[PDB]
């Protein structure tokens, strides 16, 4: 219908006319990115009338229609400043059963209003900072956490579950105090690991790689985003024994799904979310990755399993080709790989025997080629301070943390990754590697490594002291604070 016609009908109040008009309007118009100005004034007045009738108790009949109309209204910025009042947010919350009135237990399963109110909440919080700072004071996180906890004792539909998970993700990502409130006061990590084990339960005990359905993959990715947002703080090094146990539990839950695949093409997104959550886990917990029961046909190395390490290495391989958002893609992978390789000799030897082994190449610059070694040493010269440092640390821990063995490839990588403190790593000097190259090690200038081009000095003593005028050129920059 027309916005002006609906707005004019909103003043009459005919029960069997205005509701049919709203229904026809929702049936006709139901897609985002509407008009600009022909809807600006009239639909702004319509949204004012709607928020006024929403600040009062609205009609119990056709509640889904009211919420659908308000949801469609909440997609244009012109009305977000109107719907983001504390009264309107509390009304949409109590309609979504996520308000502060925790006394009404989730007994009525009237989902038609629940899912629409959750959609409205998501729409408002994702694009209205005032709505964020209002929901942070109304404390909607507690009831959402209670609902997520009551997922086994009461089976909720997929849509409501996914939409409240998305609402929780938006709320914990945008508001800062919500993160701490859900971390300490709500035991968010435990509840989210519970929800993750609940999602990863489709045909349980699948010994090979388990395939995840669409809905399960979606909800798992959402709860992984929530965990990443809630965990990255105050988990640097020191934690309690029970917290370390819970973190090892979450690490096993993520290990059992990194090797797994999802339906469609969301495999890479799910794996990236798993790696992002892995990055936040404490260092000493990551040892639960390499520890796995060596089954039949599994990747064996040093008498221990390496399927998950090889899986995340191939994930780094497939992920390095996203050159745009490269700072968010491979840096957590490199971080978790370093931290699970620094603590274990089998992982260290595996990475040294699968990342930078080949030394008998035709003597050329290592910063060229198709190898993973060549790609990493090319990345070492990047313009992002977050990715060159982590790659430097990776190639450092791979060379058993040895500077003379670090200059294995270049002499500038040391210049890139030196003086980067936060050192009792495992030092090993047992195996020695020599090929036809290291007999020619005498002809390899160290920063450039093995180019064997020699040129003479050209001043010839006629003007060496005159060539020193460049010293007078450069001396003007040495003195710093005062001439004096």
């Amino acid at each position, epitope marked *: 219908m027309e916005p002006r016609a609906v707005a004019d009908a909103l003043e009459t109040g005919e029960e069997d006319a205005v509701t049919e008009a709203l229904r026809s309007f929702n049936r006709e118009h139901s897609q985002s990115f509407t008009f600009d100005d022909a809807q600006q004034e009239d639909r702004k007045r319509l949204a004012k009338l709607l928020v006024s009738v929403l600040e009062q108790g609205l009609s119990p009949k056709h509640r889904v229609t009211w919420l659908q109309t308000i949801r469609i209204l909440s997609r244009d910025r012109s009305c977000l400043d109107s719907f983001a009042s504390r009264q309107s947010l509390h009304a949409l919350a109590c309609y979504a059963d996520i308000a502060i009135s925790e006394e009404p237990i989730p007994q009525p399963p009237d989902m038609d209003v629940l899912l629409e109110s959750l959609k409205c909440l998501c729409n408002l919080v994702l694009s209205s900072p005032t709505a964020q700072m209002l929901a942070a004071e109304a404390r909607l996180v507690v009831r959402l956490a209670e609902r997520v906890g009551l997922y086994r004792k009461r089976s909720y539909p997929h849509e409501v579950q996914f939409f409240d998970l998305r609402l929780l993700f938006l709320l914990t990502a945008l508001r800062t105090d919500v993160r701490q409130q859900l971390f300490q006061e709500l035991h968010g990590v435990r509840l989210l690991t519970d929800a993750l084990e609940l999602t990863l339960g489709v045909a349980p005990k699948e010994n090979p790689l388990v395939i995840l359905p669409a809905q399960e993959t979606e909800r798992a990715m959402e709860i992984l985003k929530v965990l990443f947002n809630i965990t990255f703080d105050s988990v640097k090094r020191e934690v309690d024994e029970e917290d370390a146990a819970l973190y090892r539990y979450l690490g096993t839950l993520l290990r059992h799904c990194v090797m797994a695949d999802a339906a469609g093409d969301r495999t890479e997104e799910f794996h990236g979310h798993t790696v992002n959550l892995l990055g936040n886990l404490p260092l000493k917990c990551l040892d639960v990755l390499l520890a796995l029961e060596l089954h039949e046909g599994s990747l064996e190395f040093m008498g221990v399993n390496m399927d998950v390490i090889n899986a995340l290495l*191939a994930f780094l391989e497939k992920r390095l080709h996203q050159t745009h958002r490269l700072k968010e893609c491979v840096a957590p992978v490199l971080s978790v790989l370093t931290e699970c390789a620094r603590m274990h000799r089998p992982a260290r030897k595996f990475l040294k025997a699968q990342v930078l*082994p080949p030394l008998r190449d035709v003597r050329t610059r290592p910063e060229v080629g198709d*190898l993973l070694r060549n790609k990493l040493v090319r990345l070492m010269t990047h313009l992002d301070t977050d990715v060159k440092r982590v790659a430097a640390e990776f190639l450092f821990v791979l060379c058993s943390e040895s500077v003379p063995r670090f200059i294995k490839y270049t002499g500038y990588g040391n210049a890139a990754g030196l003086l980067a403190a936060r050192p009792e790593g495992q030092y090993s000097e047992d195996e020695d590697t020599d090929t036809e190259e290291y007999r020619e090690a005498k002809a390899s200038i160290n920063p450039v490594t093995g180019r064997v081009e020699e040129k003479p000095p050209n001043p010839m003593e006629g003007m060496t002291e005159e060539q020193k005028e460049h010293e007078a050129m450069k001396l003007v920059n040495m003195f710093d604070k005062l001439s004096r």
Partner: nanobody
Framework: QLQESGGGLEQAGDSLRLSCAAS????????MGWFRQAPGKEREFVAY????????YYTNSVKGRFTISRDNAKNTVYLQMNSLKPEDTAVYYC?????????????????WGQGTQVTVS
């Protein structure tokens, strides 16, 4: 391009030695792998080898009777087949992997060559 040799027909229970050398004026310093292709069936994966004998991975079918090795001094990689069965009668190919990681049951990397036929009584 790669050249394979050391195949043909052989009765069941014997041993055969497959050879794969790089005579196409190309270097061999990456990971290698052997693959099978049964007639009318899709190409499968039987063996993966890292250089210097670092790691090795076989499919769940020939975990016991097949062994693989590599000698980079002659730029050759060998696949030793012991106690042949009528299950693995196919043409056998070798290839080099641009990926530094262990990849399985995928023919993502090229440089096949021609392959040698292996058949069992």
């Amino acid at each position: 391009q790669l050249q394979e040799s050391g195949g043909g027909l052989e009765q069941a229970g014997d041993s055969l030695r497959l050879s794969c050398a790089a005579s196409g004026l190309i270097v061999s310093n990456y990971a290698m792998g052997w693959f099978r292709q049964a007639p009318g069936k899709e190409r499968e994966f039987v063996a993966y080898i890292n250089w210097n004998g670092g790691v090795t991975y076989y499919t769940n079918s020939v975990k016991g009777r097949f062994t693989i090795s590599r000698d980079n001094a002659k730029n050759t990689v060998y696949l030793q087949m012991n106690s042949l069965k009528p299950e693995d009668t196919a043409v056998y190919y070798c290839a080099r992997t641009s990926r530094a990681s262990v990849t399985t049951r995928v023919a993502d990397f090229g440089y096949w060559g021609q392959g040698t036929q292996v058949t069992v009584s």
